[PDB]
A paper describes a structure:
The structure of the noeuromycin complex, in which a 1S5 conformation is observed, lends further support to this itinerary. The acid/base residue, Glu-160, is positioned to perform anti-protonation of the leaving group, typical of clan GH-A glycoside hydrolases. The O2 hydroxyl also hydrogen bonds to Asn-159 in all three inhibitor structures and the nucleophile (Glu-297) in mannoimidazole and noeuromycin structures.
X-ray crystal structures of Bs164 reveal a homotrimeric quaternary structure with each individual chain containing three domains.
Numbering used by the authors:
A (entry chain AAA): 25 to 85, 87 to 411, 413 to 681
B (entry chain BBB): 31 to 411, 413 to 681
C (entry chain CCC): 32 to 681
The structure:
């Protein structure tokens, strides 16, 4: 309010914006840059992001800021605020930027870069945020480079591990993975402290990326310590490999939930969305439709995003991504993608109060993932790629539950287990899904026992709890979840990729992936299959209940490309209060999503139809009459039945 | 101290997996259930890691505990020498890393053998777990120095006697001698401290690693030969429905290597792959019964399952176990127990099993595998890939199995070429692409003295130096009474259409044409000569230079190869040996004797009830073992899917 | 005898010489070579098989072969092939070290001084198969040369306008390094022999064309050669289109040759056993097809790898035209019919000049270099992988072949841009993604002066520094009378449906949209602008920035690309050149002249007898060559599957 001063500082009450990367490199003319900022302003965008390339400021000897001065001044002229990304000198062929210093000497070059860049550009009144580093984290961390190798050595010296647990069993300690967490914590914190030596006024921001693979690098609760907002790159062509294109709605929803969870009390925004065409770039190349641009912006805003920034407004000109990713065409005019984005910027300025106070309507369903399940999976599958026996099953399982709930029109959180609040006295009508979270330790099992005792519903499928955080299987040594599950594993038997669990009663069938789990119940009620084996159980535990099915049924739904049975089963296990209080679909709808939110007391719903046909969606739960506030293809409703067209995005206001 | 022999009572057993953290109570629970499951024997990994103390001294307590509980339940122990190695190293190191490491191994053996040789229930030392690896450590100083010394003591020339360039396969020949040296050195280290107990070793992945293994030399220092034969690691060349054939070939191969020594299968898959294995499965109860009967019918003195109980941490945690997570019997342990019980109820029959040799020997040689590796430059699938020289003879083996005929599967050096008479004996050389002068003389002698030789694919195209006498002057012209003309590459699967009877053989990849001098030509519908029969002294040679064994494999149909092979067999083999009246897809039979009494093992791997008409030998069928109530009407056996049957001929 | 554009063409074959061969077998080869109407052999002058322990040269092994060649009146192409590993099939491409360069100097002095004295020596082949994908940047000699080259070339990280650039230092050095080594080899030979022709065989040209500066090579060669092997070099095609592959390979070498005569130094003579990437045994019909395609494209020779086979390890008993009894395969009998046709038609065959339609398909080094940086080395002939910049122009080439129209296939620097008139000439730039200002000026000049320019795919998207003027200010806007708007990635295969209902073109991967200023827009059925025709001086430009050549390739249907290209050709090309009345799938025709008389080569690669209606040029069809009794009725040719036909126009 004072310490704020002129620089307008982001909060959970900020007006959301649409924006775009403005790509600055030498060779551009004043005239082409002005043309970009002018069209950006006319497209109802308030914000740009700029890579502050060290390469294009370093002179043969000193820093020359001219190239970026030119751009900041044209941004200021058009009333555009700047997210400035700290991007020290690196090879021209290094698209994403280095993730850690190479050497002590290189660290001092980074220090010097930050001093020069932040001292100079902090003086512009249109600077909105410092992005500490572009896209922290990579798959291939540089353990070979002297700086990282020395840090890992020091870290090992200051952490005593034993090769055995308290009971005497051999263990893995995951020194590499735990160091990598602390190393990201250290470098992003050090970058924040370097900026703070020269600028205590402007927001600090960072964009974690490829989150369905790199979530095991990321300690979001620690990052809150030094950030003012959490960001993200969520690119259809890089990050959504686990989904088909028609489910990029579900991918963006999960990516948004994951960042929102990491953000905690901090506001968040999507620092990068795909603005344009892959020519040679991308793993899953596309040119987003106008319809996809609208879908992604609404999903993010409905999940509390304070912003959506497109990579990129204008294109790079040379080598990697030359003439790729751009919202503008090669004549510097609007693609149908920029026209679509402009409709959302316009909607915000016409609905300022609604859009500035969005709070996601939490159903009370939390889908939890943990670092340690991903780390144990990596050691056990020895890095096969693909499937339960490959890297990524521990994320594809909970993502399948997420998709099943989306196709039921139910919100679900997607959270790292440490982001879940286990300290409350009541969990009546809260639900935790642990889908193939193969690593759980004593400490987390106590937290789950507490959650269920106090009224929580726990749903557990696949190999959840098979290992502890040291890759020791208590299924072998003495099962640590026996008390909570009221039951004990007997066998896993590997089967085909896709098989059927045929229950005894009602001739009822679940698709299952790869392994058939059998159990023995003590306190739990057994559920039997047609072969007279016990495949699942319900344990009443204090005020709560546990549903345990040790076959992977989430992955079975994914393998069968049919979430209808997982939807019906999950719905049947939910507390009545979730279904009565939350808008959802009367039944499962393939390739439709709904998520609901509130803004100052008023409830809203976001609906997207990704199927090939017009759908009539019967919305039940909550209260109110449906009023269509946003629809890009003439959706209509009759009572609470919404008729929605293929690729249409709809916002309903509940009157 | 009890020494194993060819008269020993066979046993069923299982690995007992010992690591710190286990309680006295859980270990006793394992040995008690093992004894109740009619198992006599366990195997224990004597981990150096779990005996070495901070100061480098040895503490034996963890393994004392296990040996004492074994002793209490009258269970004998196969103790595997397994020096300290990384916790993540599942299989163990195959050679010392350095001279310093060799001295650590010396010290480990002194301590472990001096101590555990004193237990009365010790049955055998396993010298090393699973000798041999695909990736031999030529980078490590110890191996690199030994290879250098070996090359200096072997004078090789770049040219042969005729002047032609040669390859000398220094790496491959050194690797043979290096395995010989390390296993012999381990045996001598044990013998410094214990001259009383059997020495054993378990070669593994034999359809790929047979080129590492000189079994005749190993006989000089072993009391028994072992094997790991795991459905999930070693049978990639087969589908699951033919793991009967895979296990039969694996058993034959070890039996051949064993020679005069007794053999047993040191490891069979006891349980489920979660994350482990190349071809993951959970064996059925029916497969456990099938594997034990195939091994015993092939003279195995034992079958040990990996594993009774599971590892607890990281690789294979809660995997491979015969017991469930409550330490009770899976259907697999219940099945194994039926076989241990059958043994104790039929001691004399089961203690004296001798495989009924049909007289058919399918031979493979190291050098064909070595030349194939140089020529295919390591492509992976197929005739143009690593493994065709093993898949070809395995296809003949499968064709004979589906005819109910036993076949040996032997390295060429394990075949006895010194006899005076080979009337009614048959050698199959199926795509054995490397043969030298010395072995061709032995084959000439074998055929002259009455032997039948069947040769298909590129058998004999190269010598042991990768020199093709097909180009320079064909070394098999004399024996074959014929000369190759050309190979022409075709599709992966094509048909050889013979002139006579419009009859059709599946063939893989290459069509061979020949010219006969002394041999009788066999012509195709295009007027080209594709095969011949050469009368040579008392014997005959059938040569078809197209790969017809691999053609059967590629077509998943061994029926034509069955009919053709049967047509070529001496009448005595068909009259004296029980076999099928015709080819049966996915059925196997192998016969054995115990004292004068003849038995047959039949397994149906098809999806339907089969009626198998058994002809040859003498006697009337009495069904002695049948886990699904097979019945016979005269010598026609009605056998259910997955059923194992033992017939006694009365 | 020095070779010229008037030389009598020959059929010939490698005579493979190594120690261990006998006088008798070598004489047998030369005698059968002479009886097969071959005049020429090629011999690898292995340094390994001449060097003695003391370092002196013993020429005996090669004297024997040269003397037997001389006795049978066979001339020799002698390949300079210094000492190298026995396992090195192709030979080293550059010296390893300064010390190694001196060994090469010494090898050339000895071999050229001695063998230049034989009267039957026709040519020195300076090096076998210059170029490889994996250049040895780690070896001292190459590493020193690259360092020196970089020191003598000043590059900046920015262009004149200030934009970041790539400079392709590695690719530009590799061009100059090949230029240097081949020129140095030529000068080393010339120290000892100024009398005999210098020759070299570039290989795998559809991948390695980016290594090869043929205009520079002309300064030191008397003839350009080539290896064009069906099993190594034609991966971008199916076997039924190896007609088109050989035609393109011949056109590419002919273009490289410029004023020099050319011949194909290596064609596949025989069977792949274990060797080759796309293994085959050429048919007799394919041998005839390849010889006629090459001679119709002005080849002065076809030499088969190989007459006889290597004996040891790699390619032992592979590639040979003779069988293992040293008699003729159907391949050698087929080749012999063409050597006989030559001696019976000496005047016609000695003066062949390809009938240039006026269509030139151009590729450039820089499009291949830019593609390699942008695709970061992804694999196949898909737009997002290495090789799309060659598969695109090859697809236009195939579409024209299936219309019976000749097309040149030329590096852009081999096209003569200096003429005053280009009326009735056509340049096709199909996905040539890199064009600089200098070449665009040359194209402006070509169109102004009457040229037709056809451009598809991402032609012109980048300059030679991987900078996209599509982004910064489009360098082809002036010539194209239009500007790119967007590329939008689609499926592998999609349809461009013109608003006219004229055309439904298959298109690959990317849909390009444009905005016309001067050009006439062409709209699709979705109302987007996908192509244009710009009148520019006397000439015209057809621009369609979607890849329709790659779309034809992906759809395996060139019919629409044929129809569209034909509709854009100057009337004069269709009236003056024999071509098909319409597109024929899997038929090719190419025409040539010999002193004023016109001929056409037709090959049917379809599964069925075709009746091909030939229109354009003048005259009545007379069948001069047909291997399967083709007939014509007026100008309709009835031609059998795999049949090669030569028509003489009367
Ligand atoms: O790949 C498109 C963009 C994704 N991430 C961004 O930070 C940029 O580095 C890339 O060019
Ligand atoms: O993979 C299962 C077992 C196979 N080989 C054995 O010797 C053990 O090392 C393994 O754990
Ligand atoms: O592979 C066949 C031949 C192709 N290129 C030739 O120069 C030889 O090196 C080969 O043996
Ligand atoms: Cl940035
Ligand atoms: Cl062991
Ligand atoms: Cl040569």
């Amino acid at each position: 309010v004072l310490f704020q001063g002129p620089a307008e500082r982001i909060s959970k009450q900020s007006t959301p914006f649409v924006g775009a990367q403005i790509f600055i490199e030498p060779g551009q003319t004043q005239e082409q840059i002005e043309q970009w900022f002018k069209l950006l302003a006319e497209s109802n965008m308030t914000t740009c992001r700029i890579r502050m390339f060290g390469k294009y400021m370093k002179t043969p000897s000193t820093y020359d800021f001219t190239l970026f001065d030119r751009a900041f001044k044209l941004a200021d002229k058009y009333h555009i605020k700047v997210y400035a990304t700290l991007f020290p000198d690196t090879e021209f062929t290094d698209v994403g930027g280095f993730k850690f210093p190479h050497s002590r000497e290189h660290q001092k070059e980074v220090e010097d870069y930050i001093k020069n860049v932040v001292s100079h550009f902090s003086q512009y009144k249109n600077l909105a945020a410092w992005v500490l580093i572009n896209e922290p984290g990579t798959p291939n961390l540089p353990f070979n480079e002297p700086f990282t190798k020395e840090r890992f050595s020091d870290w090992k010296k200051e952490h005593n591990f034993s090769e055995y647990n308290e009971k005497g069993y051999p263990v893995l300690n995951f020194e590499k993975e735990n160091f990598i967490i602390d190393y990201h914590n250290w470098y992003l914190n050090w970058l924040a402290n370097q900026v703070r030596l020269y600028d205590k006024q402007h927001d600090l921001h960072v964009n974690p990326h490829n989150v369905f693979k790199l979530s095991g690098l990321y300690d979001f609760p620690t990052w809150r310590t030094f950030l003012n907002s959490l960001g993200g790159s969520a690119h259809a062509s890089w990050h959504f490999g686990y989904f088909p294109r028609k489910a990029y709605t579900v991918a963006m929803s999960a990516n948004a939930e994951l960042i929102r969870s990491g953000a905690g009390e901090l506001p968040w925004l999507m620092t990068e969305l795909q603005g344009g065409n892959n020519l040679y770039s991308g793993a899953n190349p596309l040119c987003p439709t106008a319809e996809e641009i609208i879908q992604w912006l609404w999903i993010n805003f409905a999940t509390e995003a304070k912003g959506g920034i497109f990579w990129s407004f204008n294109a790079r000109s040379t080598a990697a991504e030359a003439g790729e990713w751009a919202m503008i065409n090669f004549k510097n005019k609007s693609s149908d993608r920029l026209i679509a984005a402009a409709t959302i910027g316009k909607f915000i300025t016409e609905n300022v109060k609604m859009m500035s106070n969005i709070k996601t309507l939490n159903s009370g369903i939390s889908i939890l993932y943990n670092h340690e399940s991903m780390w144990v999976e990596a050691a056990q599958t020895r890095g096969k790629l693909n499937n339960g026996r490959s890297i990524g099953a521990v994320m594809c399982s909970p993502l399948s539950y997420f998709e099943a709930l989306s196709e039921t029109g139910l919100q679900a959180n997607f959270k790292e287990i440490k982001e879940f609040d286990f300290s409350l006295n009541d969990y009546t009508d809260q639900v935790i899904i642990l889908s193939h979270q193969i690593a759980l330790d004593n400490k987390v099992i106590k937290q789950l026992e507490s959650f269920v005792e106090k009224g929580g519903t726990l749903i557990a499928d696949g190999l959840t709890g098979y290992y502890d955080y040291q890759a020791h299987s208590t299924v072998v040594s003495g099962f640590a979840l026996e008390n909570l599950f009221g039951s004990y594993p007997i066998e896993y038997k590997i089967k085909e990729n896709l098989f059927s669990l045929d229950f005894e009663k009602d001739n009822y069938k679940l698709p299952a992936h790869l392994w058939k789990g059998t159990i023995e119940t003590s306190k739990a009620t057994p559920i039997m299959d047609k072969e007279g084996e016990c495949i699942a159980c319900i344990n009443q535990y204090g005020k709560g209940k546990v549903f345990w099915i040790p076959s992977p049924i989430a992955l079975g739904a994914r393998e069968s490309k049919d979430f209808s049975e997982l939807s019906k089963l999950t719905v049947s296990l939910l507390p009545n209060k979730i279904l009565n209080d939350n808008p959802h679909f009367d039944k499962h709808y393939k390739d439709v999503m709904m998520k609901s939110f509130k803004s100052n007391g008023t409830m809203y719903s976001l609906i997207i139809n990704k199927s090939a046909s017009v759908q009539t969606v019967d919305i039940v739960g909550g209260k109110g009459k449906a009023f269509i506030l946003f629809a890009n293809k003439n959706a209509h409703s009759t009572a609470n039945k919404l008729t929605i067209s293929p690729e249409e995005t709809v916002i309903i206001k509940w009157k």
